């Protein structure tokens, strides 16, 4: 019963093929892991020193406390903090790499890169306080890249990619609680110090540190989006397709997979130059397709079709038609390197700090980006040739996807209804009930949850209740692969009020039809775009974020990055659902802080709920409580 | 049988008292934890994402691989890397705090702090390339503090507290392998990124990253020593005492405990100002005593007696005479906060990122250091008053300790035998066999090992074989508490050749007697002093460190900091014993890299050996192999 594993029919088809071919998948490796350790599941395990491992029984008799005296409270809080720091390290490492890419570009060191979005560059410079009048664009961009790098360490200002992106009233609440990061890598290191043995051992103190480090993660996300938009262009609405049926047996199929699109944006453009070289090898052309967030990035900017997402990533290879899988970093199952030998896929790593035994490595360098891309595409072409005459099994399953809803694009779309107060039509429709509130779906799939089931179950209920739904990362992937980004499905999925608004906006944008049921706001760092939108609404209304009818749902969360995002969503003031258990239930006091008393600090709070129908009800109640707090009917 | 728990008779006496009083200790919490998890012991557990916890059976059947595909190799290497990063975060967080203290001092912002060692300041400035001629000391010190802070992030130079402290030939070997850190907090964050799910998945690549992050840890250690010496003075030989008998029933007993002595150095001086206030409360005075490395710091600089060390720290409180325990951060068992209620000790935290539930917090600030110290000592005095009339049980057990052997002091002592080539007498005696080689004992005690048993067993065998033994941290604590820093024990402990050299040096220093059997080089960051000595010998000889007959032994290792130190000892070229199992044995390939093939990268290697007699033999063989490589008899 492949339906217990994934709700995606293309994935189910490939699961049957993998089974008959004897290829182990993530779902088989999960089954082999059961029953999983209950100490780890509940957070009641510590390996922070060589006196361990230590554990605490959730209930019963000894052990009741760690060897050094660490309580369940401390152990749970320390483990959570390290997960936040690791997520911050990934989003901010991505951003740091792009800051170096921009600096190289404008110093003349890598002419394949350039300022593509001059408007974004100037706006970011203005937001940071960097002078633009009289200045060359290359100098403004050097100052922006220098400011980005400076936010990684202590200096005479706090992290500007926090303080300049949230409203002053929110910054004031956070500063009063000591939560504004001093430097991104500074906070990561401070977490690792304070959570090491014999240091911080007070749950409230530890968790305040975690909230602060989650804002370091937010800064990394926002910095990453900003810099990628400068370098590669700010997304605007685009139409494409998703799911495995976007692979083409007669083409060279090249997946771009990971998070940082610094090379894969170049691969997109070079692949078109090599169409005749591909034709000489017997292919129709080079068919670049996306996996995970590198896929989101090229989908949002170029309409490159999305093949698949996190938990089901191996299934692209099982088709037999995936000639190359070009990897950067984050969320890549290392199984891909062994599956590649079974499927004939060439798996290629490109980042120095993310290699996989058995995968060919290309030493990507911005200065050589075009030549690296051609070397990689030539390996893919050679791989296509080797599968001449071999049948493939591409499920003939795909959806239509309208995407590219950056915050700038959303504002522009709304401006067609109110040119000089673009947010007002959205607010008007929240007030009159046509839009009940806003829900951001974010984060990953998780093998513990039948793939996409929580995202689609929750989304369906919210849409019928007139919630405006936006999505990023694998949440966007889940929704796109089930038709939620096809405007043809508005009548079926949306309540009458939401349908009326999506139709009014779409008709004013010349579409003869509505916006899609769900707005794709991009990759995981692009959760920062949702922050920009919500902060803009807060500023337009003169209220803080914790008064707005806006929630988030990491409905199938997996990565440390998703824990970090959920933690800053709480910290900026949002009710934040998580649909998998984080390792917290072994401490009632920590659980109570994260789900209840943090409301008194930041206004936000976690909603931990594994049943998706129940989670939908709790998210609706959170939205409605915010409506009532504003004096609105609900 | 308290002898199974600690070889320290004072500790055994307090273990009997704790047992009859019903006070749980670290040894009782260890017993309650048995049997410990074998997945964690071997390294074959991963909790890096919410699909976990994952584990791998060391032997047998499934599970054989993590859910995402991570092999045993990857899981073990990732866990080790995070431990190195956490150790780097602690030593370097200490150093960063002292850099801010120095900056405050010379900016006029905290007049309790000052440049005490102007010679050290000028030498550090010269080593870094900072101009001194014509410059005010306060300006030279601002530039030194700015350079210290700059080494935490990327810039146009690598980490100077690596590249300027090792010989050029060693820097060249490390650079050729990509091992020179770009920035301290940069590397910490990169480790956390690369070890997060779906990133680096090649054991060799992961472990190269770990070696590089271990050099970030070395930079933090060296920076910490440098800055503490500027601010507080470079140690010189001093005579004091150790063990619980240094507590005095008729005095206010105040322990300073942690690692960063920024406040506790001030407490030492203020305590003497308050002698009449203590007398008015019925005490003879204020008796400051050391625990762990804050204790090492004040012992090395001021001869403050050391009460106890890591694993036995609770036993100071069990005496009933410990009126206050003043905490900074690292290596503090959080049990102290609950034991304090049973024993009448006031436990006081002082650092913002290291609090303990149930302990009073004082918001220490450099600008208020004297007033904070008086507030703290007044709480201690009030606590002493509350124990008027209550019997105490201080074991009447102490040793004589000669300490204060900074590298500068060792060079000065040797200079009495050769004024203008001070290292030559040491080298001469290595060549003629009076000194077989050098062994650094470093790192902690660990509840799994009867306290001090490995340190003293190994040291005894090495000393009889004419090894010059130096020690830091809890290694120094172990050795001092068993008489190894009392020159009266040279005849008993030392081989004839070593005795002859220790006597010759001592007699030339006017002592009428030898140097002590073991030279105390200070706190854990002061392992950097041993690097300075070994690098100076390498430079004098014109060879790299991996040719020298010098080894290290973390004989009872515990903290992530000790894993980091052991890892940079290997990276700089030393055979490095560890006497507890780190979580590596679940991967033979990783074990083989760390104990064998790393020799081909850096020249150093781990020696994992839990039996101390066997470890002594293996350390001797390592020393002797180095002698033979130099053409020397052995
Ligand atoms: S830090 Fe404490 S709880 Fe954690 S492993 Fe070490 S002794 Fe156990
Ligand atoms: S990172 Fe891989 S091995 Fe680790 S918990 Fe997640 S699925 Fe398991
Ligand atoms: S005891 Fe299983 S996660 Fe540690
Ligand atoms: S299974 Fe015990 S340490 Fe994770
Ligand atoms: Fe993503
Ligand atoms: Fe120490």
Swiss-Prot record, chains A, B:
Regulation: Inactivated by O(2).
UniProt enzyme class: oxidoreductase
Record carries keyword Transmembrane helix: no
Reaction(s) this enzyme catalyzes, per UniProt: CO + 2 oxidized [2Fe-2S]-[ferredoxin] + H2O = 2 reduced [2Fe-2S]-[ferredoxin] + CO2 + 2 H(+)
Keyword Metal-binding in record: yes
EC number, UniProt record: 1.2.7.4
Residues binding [4Fe-4S] cluster 1, per UniProt: 37, 45
Positions bound to [4Fe-4S] cluster 2: 46, 49, 54, 68
Keywords assigned: 4Fe-4S, Cell membrane, Cytoplasm, Iron, Iron-sulfur, Membrane, Metal-binding, Nickel, Oxidoreductase
Required cofactor(s): [4Fe-4S] cluster; [Ni-4Fe-5S] cluster
Cofactor binding note: Binds 3 [4Fe-4S] clusters per homodimer. Binds 2 [Ni-4Fe-5S] clusters per homodimer.
Gene Ontology CC terms: cytoplasm; plasma membrane
Recorded topology in the membrane: Peripheral membrane protein
Record GO biological process: generation of precursor metabolites and energy; response to hydrogen peroxide
Alphabetized PANTHER family for the sequence: CARBON MONOXIDE DEHYDROGENASE, HYDROXYLAMINE REDUCTASE
The family this protein is said to belong to: Belongs to the Ni-containing carbon monoxide dehydrogenase family.
Protein name per Swiss-Prot or TrEMBL: Carbon monoxide dehydrogenase 2
Species the sequence originates in: Carboxydothermus hydrogenoformans (strain ATCC BAA-161 / DSM 6008 / Z-2901)
Gene: cooS2
């Amino acid at each position: 019963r492949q339906n217990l594993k994934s709700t995606d029919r293309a994935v189910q088809q490939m699961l049957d093929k993998a089974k008959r071919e004897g290829i182990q998948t993530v779902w088989d490796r999960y089954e082999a892991m059961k029953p999983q350790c209950g100490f780890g599941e509940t957070g009641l395990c510590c390996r922070h020193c060589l006196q361990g491992p230590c554990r605490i029984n959730p209930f019963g008799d000894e052990p009741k406390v760690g060897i050094c005296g660490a309580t369940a409270e401390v152990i749970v809080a320390r483990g959570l903090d390290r997960s936040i720091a690791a997520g911050a390290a990934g989003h901010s490492g991505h951003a740091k790499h792009l800051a170096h890419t921009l600096k190289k570009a404008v110093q003349g060191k890598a002419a394949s890169y350039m300022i593509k979005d001059r408007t974004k560059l100037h706006s970011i410079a203005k937001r940071l306080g960097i002078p633009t009048e009289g200045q060359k664009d290359e100098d403004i961009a050097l100052e922006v890249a220098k400011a980005a790098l400076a936010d990684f360490h202590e200096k005479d200002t706090p992290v500007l990619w926090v303080t300049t992106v949230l409203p002053p009233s929110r910054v004031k609440v956070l500063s009063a609680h000591g939560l504004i990061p001093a430097g991104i890598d500074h906070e990561i290191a401070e977490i690792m110090h304070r959570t090491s043995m014999g240091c911080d051992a007070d749950a409230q103190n530890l968790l305040l540190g975690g909230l602060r480090c989650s804002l370091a993660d937010l800064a990394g996300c926002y910095m990453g989006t900003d810099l990628a938009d400068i370098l590669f262009g700010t997304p605007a609405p685009v139409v494409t397709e998703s799911n495995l049926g976007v692979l083409k047996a007669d083409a060279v199929n090249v997946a771009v997979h990971g998070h940082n699109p610094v090379l894969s944006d170049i691969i997109v453009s070079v692949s078109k130059e090599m169409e005749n070289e591909a034709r000489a090898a017997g292919a129709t052309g080079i068919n670049v397709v996306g996996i995970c967030c590198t896929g989101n990035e090229v989908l949002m900017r170029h309409g490159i079709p999305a093949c698949t997402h996190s938990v089901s990533q191996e299934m692209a290879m099982i088709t037999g038609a995936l000639d190359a899988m070009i990897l950067d970093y984050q969320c890549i199952q290392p199984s891909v390197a062994t599956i590649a030998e079974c499927t004939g896929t060439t798996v290629i790593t490109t980042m120095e700090m993310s290699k996989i035994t058995g995968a060919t490595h290309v030493n990507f360098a911005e200065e050589a980006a075009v030549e690296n891309a051609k070397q990689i595409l030539r390996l893919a072409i050679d791989t296509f040739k080797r599968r001449k005459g071999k049948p493939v099994e591409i499920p003939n399953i795909k959806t239509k996807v309208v995407a590219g809803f950056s915050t700038e694009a959303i504002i522009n779309a709304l401006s067609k209804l109110n040119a000089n107060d673009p947010l007002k039509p959205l607010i008007d429709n929240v007030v009159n009930g046509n839009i009940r509130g806003v829900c951001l779906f974010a984060g990953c799939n998780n093998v513990k949850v039948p793939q996409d089931q929580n995202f689609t179950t929750i989304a369906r209920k919210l849409l019928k209740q007139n919630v405006l739904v936006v999505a990023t990362g694998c949440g966007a992937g889940a929704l796109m692969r089930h038709g939620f980004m096809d405007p043809a499905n508005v009548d079926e999925l949306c309540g009458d009020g939401l349908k009326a608004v999506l139709t009014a906006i779409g008709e004013a944008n010349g579409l003869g039809g509505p916006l899609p049921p769900v707005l794709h706001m991009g990759s995981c760092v692009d959760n920062s775009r949702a922050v920009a939108l919500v902060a803009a609404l807060a500023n337009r209304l003169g209220v803080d974020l914790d008064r707005l009818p806006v929630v988030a749902s990491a409905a199938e969360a997996m990565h440390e990055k998703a824990v970090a995002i959920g933690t800053w969503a709480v910290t900026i003031g949002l009710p934040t659902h998580i649909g998998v258990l984080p390792p917290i239930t072994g401490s009632l006091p920590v659980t109570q802080i994260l789900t209840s008393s943090v409301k008194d600090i930041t206004g936000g709070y976690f909603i931990v709920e594994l049943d998706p129908e129940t989670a939908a009800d709790k998210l609706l109640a959170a939205i409605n409580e915010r409506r009532a707090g504003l004096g609105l009917p609900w």
